[PDB]
């Protein structure tokens, strides 16, 4: 549910969702990352668990609909930068 860019998770937000005290959100992520359900890293000075995923989940129509809408944006940018290169370097493009 993270917005992707804000892949960090404040200790409070994790502790509030699972109604688990902050002292054990530290160990909960410790497990979940232990079995192989995550490939992130844990911070304690800030206690935001930086997250990087290699464990995907099954999808849903709305999830896929949402996943495609993001991808339409991605190809829009990939198309735009392609034009800004082909047009720019037309003489050299050869």
């Amino acid at each position: 549910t993270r917005p992707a860019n804000h892949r960090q998770l404040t200790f409070e937000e994790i502790a509030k969702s699972a109604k688990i005290t902050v002292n054990e959100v530290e160990l909960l992520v410790m497990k979940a990352l232990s079995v192989g359900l995550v490939k992130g890293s844990i911070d304690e000075v800030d206690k935001r668990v930086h997250m990087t995923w290699v464990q995907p989940r099954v999808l849903d129509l709305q999830q896929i609909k949402g996943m495609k809408d993001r991808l339409e944006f991605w190809c829009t940018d990939v198309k735009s930068m392609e034009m800004l290169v082909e047009h720019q370097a037309h003489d050299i493009l050869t």
Partner: protein, 286 residues
Amino acid sequence: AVQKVVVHPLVLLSVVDHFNRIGKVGNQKRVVGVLLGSWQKKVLDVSNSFAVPFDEDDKDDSVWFLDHDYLENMYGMFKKVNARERIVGWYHTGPKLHKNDIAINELMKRYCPNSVLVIIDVKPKDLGLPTEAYISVEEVHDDGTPTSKTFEHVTSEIGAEEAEEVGVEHLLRDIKDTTVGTLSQRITNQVHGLKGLNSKLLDIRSYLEKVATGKLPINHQIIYQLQDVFNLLPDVSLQEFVKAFYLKTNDQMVVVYLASLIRSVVALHNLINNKIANRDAEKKEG
């Protein structure tokens, strides 16, 4: 499992010939043939092929005929000519698989159990890689779904052994690009990459639209793999990376600057040397 099916240049140049042989008179869809080649650790080497009389009907999509004796006798001759080739699969130039592929593949399984079908899109000449290699697997689909035949995919790559390589290199000899690349060709290598990445992303979008609009079945697998690619993005906006990018971009500009200066002083020196050259010859003419 076959990690790769390296298709040699000669096969795709006989298939093209095979398509032309027939389509020129008997206008028809995919032309089916047999694919010979030597095995390796896991990478199947395709080194030659031949045609097999194949006739099909758009009705019932199972009134076909792939000759057995012609396939048997042909290979009887070829093992005589060269003995390192065993029948390893079949090829058809129809860009989209047919309903007849599974049944016919079962046949070619009678000659090579690990049979791989390589679809050569002879007609198209496009982004690239005109070969698509497929296997046959019958699994319980772990995740509780009907069983069926299906064609699993195997990575395809086009390579060349020494002998064909010499022939191919001369065979073009009029459109080959310089191997050095040079600035002109390197940049075109990137406008080409951008066009592809968009093209691949657009095939992804259409399918996601199809699953989104229901017209296609939610794979439930490989569907979230595309979700894997969607998490592996860089997130460049991160400050610590933003600093580290300017450093390397700045680390390189000071070399293009030193490169630029050397090319300038050499340029001026060449004009001064030339200005002396024509001037000295100018006075010396008198």
